[PDB]
Amino acid sequence: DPLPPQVVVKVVSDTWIGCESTHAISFQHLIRPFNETLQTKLLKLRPLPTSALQNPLIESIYPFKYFNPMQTMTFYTLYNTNENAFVGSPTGSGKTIVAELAIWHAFKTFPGKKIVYIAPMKALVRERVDDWRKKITPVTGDKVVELTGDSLPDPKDVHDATIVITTPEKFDGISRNWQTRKFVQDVSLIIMDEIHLLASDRGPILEMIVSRMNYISSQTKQPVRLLGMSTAVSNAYDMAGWLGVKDHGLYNFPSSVRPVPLKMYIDGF
Amino acid sequence: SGSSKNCNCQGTRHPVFDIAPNCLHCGKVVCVIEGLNKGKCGHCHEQLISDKAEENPELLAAQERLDRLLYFQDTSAERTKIIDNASDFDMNQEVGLWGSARERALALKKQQRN
Amino acid sequence: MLMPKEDRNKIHQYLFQEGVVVAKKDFNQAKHEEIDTKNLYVIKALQSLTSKGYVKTQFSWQYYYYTLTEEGVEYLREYLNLPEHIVPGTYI
Amino acid sequence: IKIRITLTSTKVKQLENVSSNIVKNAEQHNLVKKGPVRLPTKVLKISTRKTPNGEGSKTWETYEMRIHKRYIDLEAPVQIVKRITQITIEPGVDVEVVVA
Amino acid sequence: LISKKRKLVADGVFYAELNEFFTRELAEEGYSGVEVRVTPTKTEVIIRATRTQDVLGENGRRINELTLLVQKRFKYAPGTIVLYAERVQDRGLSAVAQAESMKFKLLNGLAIRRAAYGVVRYVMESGAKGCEVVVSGKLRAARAKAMKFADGFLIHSGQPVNDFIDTATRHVLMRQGVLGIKVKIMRDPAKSRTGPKALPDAVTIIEPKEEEPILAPSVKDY
RNA sequence: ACGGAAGGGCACCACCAGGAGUGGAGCCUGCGGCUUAAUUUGACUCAACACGGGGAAACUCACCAGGUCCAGACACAAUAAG
RNA sequence: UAAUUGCGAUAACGAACGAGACCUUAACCUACUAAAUAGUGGUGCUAGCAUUUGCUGGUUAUCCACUUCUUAGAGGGACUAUCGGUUUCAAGCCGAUGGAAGUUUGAGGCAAUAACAGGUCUGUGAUGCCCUUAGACGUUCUGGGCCGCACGCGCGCUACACUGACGGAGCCAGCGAGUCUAACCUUGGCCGAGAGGUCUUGGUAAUCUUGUGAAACUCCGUCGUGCUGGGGAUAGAGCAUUGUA
Ligand SMILES: [Mg+2]
Ligand SMILES: [Mg+2]
Ligand SMILES: [Mg+2]
Ligand SMILES: [Mg+2]
Ligand SMILES: [Mg+2]
Ligand SMILES: [Mg+2]
Ligand SMILES: [Mg+2]
Ligand SMILES: [Mg+2]
Ligand SMILES: [Mg+2]
Ligand SMILES: [Mg+2]
Ligand SMILES: [Mg+2]
Ligand SMILES: [Mg+2]
Ligand SMILES: [Mg+2]
Ligand SMILES: [Mg+2]
Ligand SMILES: [Mg+2]
Ligand SMILES: [Zn+2]
Ligand SMILES: [Zn+2]
């Protein structure tokens, strides 16, 4: 953490004396991307659990009254603001509730929309919907239609669907029709999880999607709110600048803080 | 202080107000600058400061781990430690007993006894 | 010269933890920087240690940079009666 | 906010380089910019006798230091101003900025 | 609050203060110059010497004290000064370093004819177009006389001398008196890579490619 | 290298045509001389003489008449907490 | 040819340093990049005279535009360009036109081999040696002297006058310099013949001193060929400033 004056290499023989040579390697090419953004856990002692929500419709559901502790700088920032921000949450530290802020973000301002969720693997599609069949639809009266490769729902149902969960590859095919697909005009917030898959093969599929919406927002001249769900990521700055997020709101917490402590052990063979 | 500069940094560039870390109505974070100059919220214009059995049991139980989470963050320097199978773990505080060998002299005396 | 033990005691102990002391070649200036004493003693008390092979001296446009040598370290330790490896100037 | 940045290198070639990148850095972010202004060169002359003694034909030298100065005026909200000073540091080319 | 009329003037003297310090401090460690780098809140300096480990030392000792001396003397705030230790590239080309070796060779009973002519062959071997060494003062006699050893070729006139030759002088203490050292080394222009790449009068022509006449109107369509 | 030797060719630190002059008068300043306690001192054609960047009231300062201090580091030996 | 700079002849060939080239500065660009720390025009508020369309103006948060003038950075621009004479018709030279520039465009920086027993120990914490090193040639305090004046020299300034002197008015530059733990450059107000003093001001400086409103200069008046109103050392008296003095 304290940057040393250099990193120096030493070569030494094993039989003679003084058969040594030294090179001092300077490192000065230290740029703002070359850092970890991170955030220190501040004094957020008093939460706004359930009571400070101003919507009795949802206050009657989600019986877990206390607000999430790990959302210190998140809380209600995106609840009212329309500004793109990055939320990196390691492990299962509220991935369900934090992904549900899309209804909190702008659904109250304009209801009956088709905000689209994106998951990296097809396995996440089932859990992101099946677990939510008895949590939102029975109480909010809003239906959710899955859009996958094995499912071909009625397009009128897709238009009337409230939340759409689609893998990037399956989303790519319907993303080929922004010119004429009348389904895709209601995009106000796009949410996706496990956004640090870019090193994988599927990452290129998802990466090109965001740049597509940036052109749509740029060309059509209206803002489209974004929301990133992921774990701790080393290059926080560069991805933040590519999502078009701004200073108010950024979540980057290390593996040091977890809901349950993690123990590690190393071995060789 | 009566200043009209609504510092809505939410603590990003300024220390947060210790007495009023946030807003009780809309969750906006109020820093120290936003705190002294106005007692009202900048977003929803709600007052920040009003002029164990009784308390909700889950409110005080919740903040208990927050202090631990703060403790976890504050005590995160050594949490990256590795047990390994090659770690000597000299278990010394700062020195090997001032770099002097008399604590094990009794072991030699014990060997002499044996 | 004849002069209180309080400041040579201060001088050497100050020289101990960081290992460098700087004193202008300004005679009779009487107020050293971050040493309340006079430079007159700071300038001369040290080449005596250099004379008995303890510290090394430069002029560098009459600024008198000082730094103790390798064996200069221990001599002061019994002079101040600190324990072995208390707080040398070799700290990382 | 009226961000004012001054540049007073002794060297001109690299100063232009560290100035050339700035103006394009403002426009690439689609920001209002007021152009670089090159103040007159400050010439620091010192005329001295050649010889160290007092003898000889009265031969004189003068020595010149050139102090070029450049500054560019920008206006922007704070979020994109703190992201300018911390970069573009090159040797012998000091950079100073004043707000308002 | 210092005017740039005086700030930078004070800035150049800070460099000159530092350089005369090292050549008095690390002379035997192959001191080869320095440059001062200024950064907002960060003041960093690059020390050039052949034995980077000796300039650095165990636990970064030598730099830590040298950083510490500059720390105290110029009243810097802790951590506002950082030293950098680096080697000199092409030690056989740098007049500052080759001046020191001559100051070394003389003190060891080595012949002024042999010792000087030794450095010149290595300088030209290391990539120099020209190089010479001047040694002045009493040499085998109480009457002062100077002998000059040179090889290659050197220019005396024009600003290329500033650009193409570097100067170096190191006095020698000897019990006959002071024997002066003056070294001017002319680097290869071909490796200048910063500004000019050759002498001003150097005019070169790229060789063409000759072509035989077609001798016939010919047709290539697409 | 020198020539009251020759050829050829240069130069307002040479000349010609001329300007403005200095050498004459007052004073400022420098050098020699005289003097004094001292009037510190280097340089004497070009290549010294408003030059030592020297226009010095103290300082500068080296000189004159005087008065304080030791900066003798370090080592050795002597005296020695009556 | 300014040039061991060239043509050429040739017991020499091929090289090298000096010269030149190099670079700094000076004038050209109505061309690129721009600019209240520069300016120009128009437009808002506003002063004066004829008033009718004007002329002279003032105005920082009244705006908008521009870069001719001022700044630079980047570039171009001169190579004797072209024409005519003269020379083995070879380097060149001379004249003319054009050109901002045609005596390497002017002025500089730079500047060799060899040498002086030139100057310097009074720049050097650069040094070899010698003298001294404790009522010291060391250091430091009071007061002198470095300035003393029968004379002789050198760099000089001021003049001996109507191309003048003096009183009024007209009224113009450029290279520069200037404060932080200090007290720098000082506008404006006020006091004071003047010297100068006091209360503030802006300026760490293309933005404040400063248009440095300088002088010699121009015009209108006084004087009048008199060692005179030229010239101002000499002396004496007093008033302020510097700095402990
Ligand atoms: Mg002439
Ligand atoms: Mg004549
Ligand atoms: Mg005359
Ligand atoms: Mg001559
Ligand atoms: Mg005196
Ligand atoms: Mg005196
Ligand atoms: Mg007006
Ligand atoms: Mg012709
Ligand atoms: Mg010339
Ligand atoms: Mg000298
Ligand atoms: Mg004198
Ligand atoms: Mg003269
Ligand atoms: Mg008149
Ligand atoms: Mg002017
Ligand atoms: Mg008169
Ligand atoms: Zn704030
Ligand atoms: Zn609120």
Side-chain angles (χ1 to χ4, degrees), chain A residues 48 80, chain B residues 22-28 30 40-48:
Chain A
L48 281 83
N80 46 3
Chain B
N22 55 355
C23 169
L24 61 83
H25 197 26
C26 71
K28 298 288 96 175
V30 167
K40 207 69 70 176
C41 178
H43 180 273
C44 77
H45 297 284
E46 200 73 21
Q47 42 95 29
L48 282 72

Side-chain angles (χ1 to χ4, degrees), chain A residues 40-46 48 52 54 65-66 69 76-77 80-81 247-248 256-257 263-267, chain B residues 8-9 19-28 43 56 58-59 62 65-66 70 73 82-85:
Chain A
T40 302
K41 204 61 166 169
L42 60 86
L43 194 58
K44 199 67 165 62
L45 73 164
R46 56 151 197 250
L48 281 83
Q54 302 90 42
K65 188 263 292 177
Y66 167 57
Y76 273 35
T77 298
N80 46 3
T81 60
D247 55 349
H248 290 97
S256 66
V257 65
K263 182 62 179 67
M264 61 79 70
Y265 195 20
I266 49 170
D267 283 319
Chain B
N8 289 61
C9 75
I19 301 105
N22 55 355
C23 169
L24 61 83
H25 197 26
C26 71
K28 298 288 96 175
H43 180 273
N56 214 356
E58 54 268 15
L59 294 174
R65 56 184 181 139
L66 277 296
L70 294 174
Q73 194 268 327
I82 310 180
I83 285 289
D84 200 350
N85 263 359

